[PDB]
Every structure is written in structure tokens, then in C-alpha cells.
DNA sequence: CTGGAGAATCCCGGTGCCGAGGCCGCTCAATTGGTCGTAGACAGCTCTAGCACCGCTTAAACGCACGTACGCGCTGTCCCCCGCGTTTTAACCGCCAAGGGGATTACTCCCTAGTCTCCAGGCACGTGTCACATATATACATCCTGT
């Protein structure tokens, strides 16, 4: 097929399921690298990393929803960078 | 470190967009997503390490992350104990 | 009358796909890089390192910011990569390096069946009469990693150097195990 | 002495009025907490918990499950008009957003007979 | 040498069973419910404290909590909580 | 009563001009009126609650300041 | 692409109106001086996670190839907001009764609430099982082979 099929089925599936979409191991290294800049030799509880991942995934899902809305605003189906930029600006994160 | 922000590959961002109702994704969306997730994690982890250092602790507890998210208005349930 | 020498090593590693790209035209995945010889963070005094690739690529002028300084890219032929190192102090003249992207092996190395090509050269950045700020930045450089730092210039010889120990120990352990435990079971 | 009666039983609440008043008196929220404040707080907490639990159980029965999970809590919170308004800022672990139906794919495009 | 930590799992499972006899709840769902309980607790307590402070009052009373519930809970959700609290206070002072 | 029309077309036009807008659609005014009505209703409900709690008959300006503070619209210049 | 008008600004100097600043005089609230239980800090001790690996498995990320579908630009033309002038109108007055509506202050007083006991029962913790998931005998059950 083309731009019109499997994306919708993937939407349906990944919205029905609630598993973590981001891999645990690669995200843990990212979190530790971000923490490095604040305190050397820092430890993280597993539950803390899981909470960080959950918060990040929820924030990204909300951002993509607001970005899908921005894309639909311009008669467009594809989300472009300016969509996320507008979503963040109206959010007040990068005004 | 070895550029761990690239540990968020295109399939992961694509799944996240799928869950967010996105129908089609552009090519440059992935860089913007990795930069926004990075900025968010920066603030969250800064708040967590600020709560930790003040406690003279060497481990970032889950309660620290919960309080950090609560400061940002991102209150998270599931780790309150 | 102040002279500070910062040894560096620049080059590239290349891996052959085993077959030419279906429609693209690439055959080797290569990564040009610039890293220090001593275990120290170069970003303490380096602001950015620009890698000007061949014009055939969409963006020939690549940029990196932190201690690594490597861009991973695929290609099909060898060409000269112009590397320009910019320092934090704008009053210090940037350093320009010329590296020939090497992707193919020599007949001798090809016969050995080694897959990874390596070509990096030893170099030293000489800072003659640097500014006070630049002097402080160069003298205050911290260590980069807790582990060791190594280079595989040629690799043809480093692979043999590593194997002479690795395979030796592996075979010794395998023998000590198989020759002894079977007889122990026999008893 | 006389058989001691708890404050949760007197009012008729399940949540702990005692522990509520305890957290309040040494929580620095005020200088001298009133005797009725904790009762009212516990009653409101109990009512909200009962409502959300009713909605979660309804969602679970609709999903043909017996044990309530973050899925059901998220569904209940985002379906109700007022609970979502109350918990808009909140995010739940192992939760998910409301999904879309894939039946739309069938009467638009499917695999053809070509080399089927 | 025990390090015991408290929770509302005891009053929430009871409430669940009294409202849903046949339906249970998982451990993580129980933790989420406890987190919600604590969050609403904090919100109501802070609102009542601030309301009392506005009137130059050093005591949080049932009236302050009632107005805080009126303020926090939206639309047709506050009224029910206020009614439940009032009926519990009236039944509490009646010595039943 | 129905005096919501007190926020007339020129007032909304000036409010938009202050916001950088240079061209407004025709259907913008009836939407801005409803948005402002909802925002008011909310702030005034909060202020009236604060006033009833204080057993006072007059909605003081500080009550409005607190009502706005609840909605995150912290207004400086009236007491806090 | 200038002219050629033509409004719009906008310097720039002028001048009273009235808020901003200052000064005075008390009131009250921060300082002083001193006593008195905690707070928490710090010195151990325990043992729970946290980290760090290592191996096997394989999902998954990924690059490529390959259309189709969606994005962008272009175009046409045709509605609906802009600019601006006229009639309308509401928003300011001013009027003319005669007094209260309600925040604000204050003083008793007195119920309510802190404080501070002693207890004992009800809720964190340890342990007993039971619902669902897992891995394995098994009685046939379908090709293969003498025959």
C-alpha cells in the first residue's frame, strides 16, 4: 500500500496497548548522561528511571497530539517541524 | 558519553507519534523530538538532582523525580508508595 | 615565551558492506573522527571542529561540539576531508588538517580478510604565545574517561597483537578444561 | 474506660479521619487545625475515591477483566468530563490515551488478489 | 529496624469492595489510587490553609475545608462532596 | 439583562490590534464574547466564593486578585 | 522611480495640575538580654539496592528500493472585511428629594482547642493458602516398512 494504511493500524494498536514505547536500556543511558552534567557518580533507583520514562512518554504523546492538531490546521496530514515549534511556543516553553 | 540521545531511534518516536494520533510523520520531526525530549529530561533531572544533593544522598530516589515532575505541573501517579 | 603542545589523532574507520548498495551506490560505512592522544577533554579549549566532505553529499560541511568529534557517513570512493578546528578563544587562529578518506584495503591487508579499515595520523597542536584565557583553558583541561585511550592506526598489526594474547589465553583455558574434566569424570 | 470509638466510624467514613487529622496537625498547614476540617477532608476523599473506583470497575467490566489496572484508571479519568478537568495535569504510569478504531481500514483498501 | 511505610490501601480496598463487591484492584492500581488520595489531600489542605490565612485566621475549620472543596472540585462534582461532608459532620456531632 | 454585548466590535478590534493582529474575521467577535464571558464567569465565581467565605457583602479587589491567582493569571498592581 | 501632494507624526519649547517626595510626630514592632528544652547533626551499624557485568535469544531498529500521496506553487475569481462618511445613541452630565448600608473598631466573655497524659485497638507486617500460568505423561494417530 501507500500513505494511508498501516499508519492507522499502528495508531490503533499502540493506543490500545500501554507498554513503554521507548526501550528501557537506551533511555537509561540517556538519563544517566543527562544527570552526569549535575553530579558525578550519581545513582538512580529503578523506579525513578521508570517514572522518568513514563513522564517523558506522556509529555511526548501530548506534544504529538498538539502537533497533529497543528498539522491538520494547515490542511496537512504530515507533521512538520514548525508544527512542534508552534505547539511549544503556544505552550510557553520556548516563547 | 557516546551520544546516548541517539538511543531514541526512529521507530520509538514513530510509535510515540502513533499513540498521539499522528497520521504521517516528516523526516525532520525526529530531530525536533529528540531535542524536546532532551530539554524536558534536562529540567526534570536538574530538579531531581537539586532535591537529591540537598538531602546529602548519593541516589536519586523515585520520590525526588515525583516532586520534580510535580513542580513542572506534570504530577505523576504510580510511584507515591 | 609560553608554548603548550596538545597531541591529537585524526583519521577515519571504514567497514565494507560486503556488496554494493542496491540503488544508492555506497560500499563502505566510514566514520571520520578527531580525538586527543592523551586522556583529556578537548572541548575545554575546542569550540567546534568542521568536517568539509565532498560536494556530492547534501551537506558537505559537518560540525561537532563535544570531546568525541566523529561523523558517521556512507560513501563509495576516497576523497580528501578538510578538518578545521576552532577554539573557544576567537583570538586564536583555527587549525586546519587534511585527511585522505581511506576506504579500500591494500592487497596484503585484503588477503588477511580483515574487515575494518583504519587510517589515523598522530599530530600535535602547538600554541605559541597563547592568550591568558587560552593558556588557562589549555592548562585546566580535565580527564575525559576513566578507562584507557587507544588508537588502531593501520589495525592490521594491532589485530595480530591482540589475537596473540586473546587466542592464546582462550586455547589455554579450553585445553585446561577439556583435557582435565573428562579425566576427572573418568575417575 | 469506655469502649473507644474511632472518628471514621462515628462520621461513617472508611478513609482514616484519625490519620488525616494527624497529617494535618503536624503538617504545618496551619497552627491549630479545627475538629471538623479532617472529617470533611476525609469525607471528600472517600467520595472521590468511590466515584473513581466505580468508573474503573465499570471500565474493567466493559473490558472483561477482574483486576483494575492503570489502563482502567486512565480510561475512567479521561472519559468523565469533570474528573479529567480535575486531573488534567496528572499523568499515570503504564497508562494510555484513548484509542481509535481500525475498522476504517477495511472499506478503503486491503490486500488484492495479486499473488494472494 | 523495620522501616514501615503507611498507605491508604486499607480504606481504598474497603471502599472498592463496598462499591464493587465482585471487582478487585491490582497493586499498581492501588498505588495510583493512593497517589490520587494524597494529591487531593494536599490540594484541599493547602487551599484551606490559604483561605484561612486570607481572613487572618490561624485555624483551618470545617468551613474553610468546605469552601476549599467548593473551589477545587469543578461543576457537578463539588456539590456532592460538600453534601457528603455536611451529612457526615451532622451525623458526627449527633453522637451516633 | 443580557448586557454581554457591552464588549462591542471596536473594543475587540482594539484588543486584537494590541495583540499584533492586523485583520480580523467577521465571526471572531461572537467567539471572543463567549470566551471572555467564560473567563469572567470563572473568575467572578472564585471571587464570590472568597467573599462569601469572609462573611462580607462587597467583593473586594483583593478577592479578585486571589481569584485570578487561582487561575494562574497573577495580577500585580492591586495588592498582590 | 520619481515626483507631487498630503496627511500624519513628531521635535520642541511652554505651562499649570497634582502626584511624588519629604518632613513630623507618635506606635508599634523589631532588638536586646537571658533562660530552656528540642532539632538535627554527626558518629556508627546494617543490609538493601545499585551497579556491573556476562551469555543467549531475537525483536527490532535499519538501510534500500519503490511507488503513491501528499505538499507547494500557481491561478482565477469571486466574497467579505477595510476605509471612511453619515445618522444614531448611549454615556457622560446635572437635577432634587432625605438619610442609611456596611465595612471597621472595639469589649467583653466563653466555647473550643492545645497540651499532655495514659492506655488499647486498629492498621503495617508476616504467613496461609487459592486463582491463573507452566511443563510434562499419554492414548491414540498419521507415514513408513516389511511382507
Numbering used by the authors:
A (entry chain C): 41 to 135
B (entry chain D): 22 to 102
C (entry chain W): 18 to 204
D (entry chain A): 11 to 126
E (entry chain B): 27 to 122
F (entry chain H): 23 to 102
Quote the authors verbatim.
The ATP-dependent chromatin remodeler SRCAP complex (SRCAP-C) promotes the replacement of canonical histone H2A–H2B dimer with H2A.Z–H2B dimer. Here, we determined structures of human SRCAP-C bound to H2A-containing nucleosome at near-atomic resolution. SRCAP-C can be divided into motor and ARP modules, which merge at the ATPase of the SRCAP subunit. As a scaffold, the SRCAP subunit consists of an N-terminal helicase-SANT-associated (HSA) and pre-HSA helices that integrate the ARP module, an ATPase domain grasping the nucleosomal DNA, and an insert threading through the RUVBL1–RUVBL2 hexamer.
The ADP-bound state of SRCAP-C–NCP is a post-hydrolysis state, where the ADP tends to dissociate from the ATP-binding site. Compared to a canonical nucleosome, the ATPase in the ADP-bound and ADP-BeFx-bound states lifts the tracking strand of the nucleosomal DNA at SHL 2 from the histone surface. The nucleosomal DNA spanning positions 47–60 (with the entry end numbered position 1 as a reference point) exhibits distortion, and this distortion is more pronounced in the ADP-bound state. The RUVBL1–RUVBL2 hexamer-associated ARP6–ZNHIT1 dimer dissociates from the motor-proximal H2A–H2B and relocates near the dyad of the nucleosome, causing a displacement of up to 81 Å. As a result, the movement of the ARP6–ZNHIT1 dimer might lead to the dissociation of the positively charged N-terminal region of ZNHIT1 from the acidic patch of H2A–H2B. The entry DNA undergoes unwrapping from the histone octamer by ~15 bp, which would otherwise cause a steric clash with the relocated ARP6–ZNHIT1. Nucleosomal DNA detaches from H3 (helix αN) at SHL 6.5 and from H2A (loop L2) at SHL 5.5, resulting in a partially exposed and possibly destabilized H2A–H2B dimer. Consistent with the entry DNA detachment, the cryo-EM map in the ADP-bound state showed the absence of the H2A C-terminal tail and the presence of density extending out of the H2A core and winding over the subdomain4 of ARP6. It suggests that the density is derived from the H2A tail (residues 110–127) and the basic motif (H123HKAKGK129, positively charged residues are underlined) may generate charge–charge interactions with the acidic pocket of ARP6. By contrast, in SRCAP-C–nucleosome structures (ADP- and ADP-BeFx-bound states), histone octamer remains in canonical conformation and DNA unwrapping was only observed in the ADP-bound state, in which ZNHIT1 binds neither the entry DNA nor the H2A–H2B dimer.
